[PDB]
Amino acid sequence: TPAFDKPKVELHVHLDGAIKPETILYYGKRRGIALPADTPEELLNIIGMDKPLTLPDFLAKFDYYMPAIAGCRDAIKRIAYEFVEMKAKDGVVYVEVRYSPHLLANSKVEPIPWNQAEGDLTPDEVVSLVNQGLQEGERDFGVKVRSILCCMRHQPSWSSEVVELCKKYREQTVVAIDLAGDETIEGSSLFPGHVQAYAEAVKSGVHRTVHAGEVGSANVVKEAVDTLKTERLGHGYHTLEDTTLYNRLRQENMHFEICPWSSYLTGAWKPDTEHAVIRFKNDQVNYSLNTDDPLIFKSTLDTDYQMTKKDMGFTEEEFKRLNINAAKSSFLPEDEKKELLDLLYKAYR
Numbered sequence: 001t002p003a004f005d006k007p008k009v010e011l012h013v014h015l016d017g018a019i020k021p022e023t024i025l026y027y028g029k030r031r032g033i034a035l036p037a038d039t040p041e042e043l044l045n046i047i048g049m050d051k052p053l054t055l056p057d058f059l060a061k062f063d064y065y066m067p068a069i070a071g072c073r074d075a076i077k078r079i080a081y082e083f084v085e086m087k088a089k090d091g092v093v094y095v096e097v098r099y100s101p102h103l104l105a106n107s108k109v110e111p112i113p114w115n116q117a118e119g120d121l122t123p124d125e126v127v128s129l130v131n132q133g134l135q136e137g138e139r140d141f142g143v144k145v146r147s148i149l150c151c152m153r154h155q156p157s158w159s160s161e162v163v164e165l166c167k168k169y170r171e172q173t174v175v176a177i178d179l180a181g182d183e184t185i186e187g188s189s190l191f192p193g194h195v196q197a198y199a200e201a202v203k204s205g206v207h208r209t210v211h212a213g214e215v216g217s218a219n220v221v222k223e224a225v226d227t228l229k230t231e232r233l234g235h236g237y238h239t240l241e242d243t244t245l246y247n248r249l250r251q252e253n254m255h256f257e258i259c260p261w262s263s264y265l266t267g268a269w270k271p272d273t274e275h276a277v278i279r280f281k282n283d284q285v286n287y288s289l290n291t292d293d294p295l296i297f298k299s300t301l302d303t304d305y306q307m308t309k310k311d312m313g314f315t316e317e318e319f320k321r322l323n324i325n326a327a328k329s330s331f332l333p334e335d336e337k338k339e340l341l342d343l344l345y346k347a348y349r
């Protein structure tokens, strides 16, 4: 009813798509930007999807709300905080949250995002503020939280400062680097920018995830494993298109960060098909359940859980093992990771 009331782990959720409708009206109103509408209510319904659209119809969503938050220090910090209490309500005990620091900035970034005017919020103090509110979320709401800073495909030039933001803000709360945005652009996993950033990540012990095979071919996953050296995959559905690659990843115990509900809504999965997750369930792969963008997809974690237990016969035993897998493949230090494990066993039995 909730499908699974037991603590949970989430490894794959974007901050900048888990923003309360109510607080976007609050900052659009207080700053000029003025959204396409002005009850909370009527706002969620347009900035949210119920059906697949195209890529530019998807990005335009960002184009309503982002400029109302980006570039206000006030806002950056609250959304971080409000993110943590949103997760306490889902029953999460540990989450990793990801975002691009450049996309919330308005100076020392080129271009300037969202066609904002120039201010003085730089990439590097955005990571400082999210960290703040993420920490005081932690200690008010009971949810252990870390973060992930996203590289953007289209912009290899930002990547090297992503990886240095990762190193400078190390366990306080940044634990990994990611690559997001549009794995359709040719060759983008092999751009020199992204490549040397992941090399520097390897060099300096920052953990790695990549979004790959959501909408891209299995060759994009292969680029992610062999050349970017990821430790985990965002989505990775398209690895199923290549069977040796799939079998090998299974042997290697790769972690797949699955977004079930996300997948239907985006078009990455078409409901006339096998869901990739049930395959992963039947093959006992290492995967997690995640909601990706609850603002956009209209959703909550328990949405993912309900869709998996209703439409695909998951059971309570699977749900527990997948959260155990999630924890094991989390990017915590080994010590805090054993304590997380122990916690879950004790409440799973």
Ligand SMILES: NC(=O)c1cn([C@@H](CO)CCn2ccc3ccc(NC(=O)CCCCc4ccccc4)cc32)cn1
Binding pocket: 014, 015, 016, 017, 053, 054, 055, 058, 059, 062, 098, 099, 100, 150, 180, 181, 182, 183, 215, 266, 267, 292, 293
């Ligand atoms: N789910 C996501 O892809 C996502 C990305 N973000 C932020 C960072 O946390 C980036 C927002 N953003 C800005 C430029 C940009 C360019 C591309 C993408 N993402 C993609 O290309 C993934 C496509 C998402 C799946 C899909 C496919 C086809 C049609 C509709 C939807 C995000 C982008 C938040 N959520």
Ligand SMILES: [Zn+2]
Binding pocket: 012, 013, 014, 180, 211, 234, 292
């Ligand atoms: Zn994602």
